[PDB]
Swiss-Prot record:
The keyword rRNA processing does not apply. The keyword Nucleus applies. This is Nuclear receptor subfamily 1 group I member 2. Residues 5-274 form the NR LBD domain. Nuclear receptor that binds and is activated by variety of endogenous and xenobiotic compounds. Transcription factor that activates the transcription of multiple genes involved in the metabolism and secretion of potentially harmful xenobiotics, drugs and endogenous compounds. Activated by the antibiotic rifampicin and various plant metabolites, such as hyperforin, guggulipid, colupulone, and isoflavones. Response to specific ligands is species-specific. Activated by naturally occurring steroids, such as pregnenolone and progesterone. Coiled coil: none annotated. Its main location: nucleus. It is found in: Nucleus. GO terms for molecular function: DNA-binding transcription activator activity, RNA polymerase II-specific; DNA-binding transcription factor activity, RNA polymerase II-specific; nuclear receptor activity; nuclear receptor binding; RNA polymerase II cis-regulatory region sequence-specific DNA binding; RNA polymerase II transcription regulatory region sequence-specific DNA binding; sequence-specific double-stranded DNA binding; zinc ion binding. Hyperforin binds at S88, Q126, L127, R128, F129, H248. GO terms for cellular component: chromatin; intermediate filament cytoskeleton; nuclear body; nucleoplasm; nucleus; transcription regulator complex. Keywords: Activator, DNA-binding, Metal-binding, Nucleus, Receptor, Transcription, Transcription regulation, Zinc, Zinc-finger. It comes from Homo sapiens.
Length: 275
């Protein structure tokens, strides 16, 4: 059964989530849009992470639709980067507000707050993006914006070869509750193994408590044979998200080295000093 401390932990996380997650993206406005050496550039073909179609549904009922180009050996592969940087920044701001509303996070030293945010911001963004992911249509439904995955030669199986997309499809298939998503966010945020964390023992004990609460929540609310080992499946998903995070940071820094695009907040979270 759930203890009162566990019920209070979940409510504190759930309240932080509702206050800082605009599930309709209604305040994402004024964002940029796409217009109307050599082995560096060769691995920079990783920008096929910008093979997304874009839809904007106006309040008037009008619809704008963007189909991205194909790589012709030029600068056209960067066309989606400024927009995606603006969405990541909007999402990052939501993640930061989330952490700052949590009492457990507020009580940590400010240096550890920064170290935990720098270490986990991307992971918490993906966890939030999973909740608006449509696994049937392969689209992230962000209110009036929709990000559709463009048809690949292999179709769904080829898309599931990119770890990020496989994570989204696999995590979506677990059909988690809002409470389980927010506990995943807590476990990812309070990670003692992050570079620069001073209060390593406090952060570790907090992470352990969030994990017991998730384990207990699943045990109390999910008796069905389909949810056997669910707690352990979630923990492995978070271990994989850390590897995707590390892979994504390297991919991002390589693009930034060639074609700078990162916003000030992204630079801060990724350590880019401006010099
Ligand atoms: O998490 S997302 O849904 C998201 C995040 C932020 C805003 C909106 C959506 N996502 C989808 C996403 C992820 C991977 C792929 C893909 C597909 C085929 C082959 C290889 C890969 C397609 C879409 C994603 C994540 C990271 C990035 C970036 O940081 C950016 F563009 F923002 F700079 C990167 F490209 F630099 F990596 C861009 C999209």
């Amino acid at each position: 059964g759930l203890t009162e401390e566990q019920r209070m932990m979940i409510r504190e996380l759930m309240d932080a989530q509702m206050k800082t997650f605009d599930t309709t993206f209604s305040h994402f406005k004024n964002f940029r849009l796409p217009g109307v050496a050599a082995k560096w550039s060769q691995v920079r073909k990783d920008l096929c992470s910008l093979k997304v179609s874009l839809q904007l549904r106006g309040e008037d009922g009008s619809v704008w639709n963007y189909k991205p180009p194909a790589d012709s050996g030029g600068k056209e592969i960067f066309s989606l980067l400024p927009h995606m940087a603006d969405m990541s920044t909007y999402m990052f701001k939501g993640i930061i507000s989330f952490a700052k509303v949590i009492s457990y996070f507020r009580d940590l030293p400010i240096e550890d707050q920064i170290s935990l945010l720098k270490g986990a911001a991307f992971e918490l963004c993906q966890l939030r993006f999973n909740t608006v992911f449509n696994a049937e249509t392969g689209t992230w439904e962000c209110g009036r914006l929709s990000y559709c995955l463009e048809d690949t030669a292999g179709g769904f199986q080829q898309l599931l070869l990119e770890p990020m997309l496989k994570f989204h499809y696999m995590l979506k298939k677990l059909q988690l509750h809002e409470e389980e998503y927010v506990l995943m966010q807590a476990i990812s945020l309070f990670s003692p193994d992050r570079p620069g964390v001073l209060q390593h023992r406090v952060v570790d004990q907090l992470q352990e408590q969030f994990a017991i609460t998730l384990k207990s929540y699943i045990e109390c609310n999910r008796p069905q044979p389909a949810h056997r080992f669910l707690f352990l499946k979630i923990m492995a998903m978070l271990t994989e998200l850390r590897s995707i995070n590390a892979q994504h940071t390297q991919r991002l820094l390589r693009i930034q080295d060639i074609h700078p695009f990162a916003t000030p907040l992204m630079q801060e979270l990724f350590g880019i000093t401006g010099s």
